[PDB]
Design a protein around this ligand. Structure first.
Ligand SMILES: NC(=O)c1ccc[n+]([C@@H]2O[C@H](COP(=O)([O-])OP(=O)(O)OC[C@H]3O[C@@H](n4cnc5c(N)ncnc54)[C@H](O)[C@@H]3O)[C@@H](O)[C@H]2O)c1
Ligand SMILES: NC(=O)c1ccc[n+]([C@@H]2O[C@H](COP(=O)([O-])OP(=O)(O)OC[C@H]3O[C@@H](n4cnc5c(N)ncnc54)[C@H](O)[C@@H]3O)[C@@H](O)[C@H]2O)c1
Lengths: 282, 282
């Protein structure tokens, strides 16, 4: 599978597109308006320049990756691609429309994959007549660098479809891991409550921000502490993920701290608002 | 603090002996049998050679260090020490008696600190009449190398004992962090439940061992995955800590999985037994 259709062209779409293109795939990327696609492309172009300045790749590799990527708003261009990776907005109604339409359009061979962090693949695939070829392909930000893809098997995802997505992932130099679908998969299910735990510690006056983080970094060799990491993932995202784990499981274990909900209601979302657990400046 | 008494010639107490001595403190290490003390002094000795091999230090340094360390099995030898660091077995009734004993032996100014991961500094302090001078000094294995020390204030630990242990942590080149005593402090309170969650992920069929650990390594940039890390800490230790956190809080969030109890009951404790989540060799 060398021809890849990617829907959406924000952070993860752009990153995913680059990931596929950088290892020689032909990639079409589809967004809604035309300035979105352009942005997605300029995003990727800025990222590759950062790789050239690092002397990680040549200016020629950059032009070549770019040469492998095309923009469109036409969903019909999906019809002859080997893999679709949907990385549009995290809304179930819409993902179900996208996947239905994609079911109509694409040849019967095409595998259809979502990059959703928090929505059920099984539920998405149920909107199609291709459940055996719907699958989750959950990448990690920034997708061109991070080597993991959680490969999320829905209830009806075939062995054959999993094996194909696995080889496809290795073919672009990523390490796929098989996941029977469950909330939070593996990574977010471990990582996020670890961040929520650091909010509880703080809320219960056990220790202060800088200390909680130094402790995780020096005591556990984590490259960044949990609170900084929350500020970096976004506190709204952290909060939404603890809510999904809690609503899906009914398990009081995944209850978010009151302090986290308050920071999100203040708009203290982290870096991207210049304030979360830490105050930031440009 | 010129002079340090350490209880325990085991893994940690040997490591803590080394951490102090190697920065020029005198140290008296006390265990309950000579064999043990000997074992301990050999361990510092072989660890100091290793440094020597890589020209981290020369022989004169090594033996200069070794000359600062004396062994004993008599508690009464703590009478002139400036700081005690108790790293004996994790058992309340024993710690209480040690600390009662130390309170009788030591000059009024000596600070009594414990390296306990899971017992209340405050309860230990109440077995003495010098609660203001009792504190936890929680090091990380290997104590020579790992920089962090969680400094754990009991309810009655004074500002001046805190300030003193802080300066002393720094003076041996460690980074102290202030902790108001609560179960699991900071590090283990985040880290251990993370390993327990991975055991839950495994028990519920979500994904297999190696995949869980590649996920956390490649998806979150953690230096090791949590299952391997559990095997390294010892699953008996993971379980005990989840059990303290659960009995101390009454919160079901910290309930250990059944898979964890089962592995512990099989003797599959980790590397130390040659088998935990993974099978090991030599
Ligand atoms: N760090 C992360 O953002 C991250 C990591 C892993 C997974 N995810 C998941 O990836 C998905 C996308 O997240 P993102 O961060 O790129 O969001 P984003 O908001 O930055 O980008 C979403 C893009 O999808 C486009 N879009 C909306 N409706 C569309 C449609 N019908 N067709 C084509 N494009 C459409 C939008 O125009 C937008 O450009 C979500 O499912 C999210 O849960 C995100
Ligand atoms: N990784 C770790 O081992 C680790 C890390 C952080 C904290 N701790 C804590 O530090 C303490 C020691 O654990 P360890 O791993 O070194 O155990 P260990 O079994 O390696 O050594 C404990 C030593 O204490 C000795 N001992 C028992 N009763 C004693 C007494 N009354 N006086 C003097 N010595 C006595 C034993 O002879 C033994 O050699 C525990 O409280 C534990 O929770 C351990």
């Amino acid at each position: 599978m060398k021809k890849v259709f990617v829907l959406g062209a924000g952070t993860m779409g752009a990153g995913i597109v680059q990931a596929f293109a950088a290892k020689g795939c032909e990639v079409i990327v589809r967004d809604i308006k035309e300035e979105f696609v352009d942005r997605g492309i300029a995003t990727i172009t800025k990222s590759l320049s950062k790789l050239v300045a690092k002397e990680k790749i040549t200016e020629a590799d950059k032009e070549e990756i770019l040469s492998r990527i095309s923009g469109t708003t036409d969903m019909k261009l999906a019809a002859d691609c080997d893999l679709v990776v949907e990385a549009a907005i995290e809304n179930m109604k819409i993902k179900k429309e996208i996947f239905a339409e994609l079911d109509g359009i694409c040849k019967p061979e095409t595998i259809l994959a979502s990059n959703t962090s928090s929505l059920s693949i099984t539920e998405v695939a149920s909107a199609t007549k291709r459940a055996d070829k719907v699958i989750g392909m959950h990448f990690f930000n920034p997708a061109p660098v991070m080597k993991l893809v959680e490969v999320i098997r829905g209830a009806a995802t075939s062995q054959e479809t999993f094996d194909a997505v696995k080889e496809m992932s290795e073919s672009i130099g990523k390490t796929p891991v098989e996941v029977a679908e469950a909330p939070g998969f593996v990574v977010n299910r471990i990582l996020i409550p670890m961040i929520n735990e650091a909010t509880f510690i703080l809320q219960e006056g056990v220790a202060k921000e800088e200390d909680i983080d130094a402790a995780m970094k020096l005591g556990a060799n984590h490259p960044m502490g949990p609170l900084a990491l929350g500020d970096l993932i976004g506190l709204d995202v952290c909060l939404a993920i603890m809510d999904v784990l809690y609503n899906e499981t009914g398990d009081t274990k995944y209850r978010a701290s009151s302090l986290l909900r308050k920071y999100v209601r203040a708009g203290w979302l982290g870096r991207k608002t210049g304030k979360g657990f830490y105050d930031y400046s440009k």
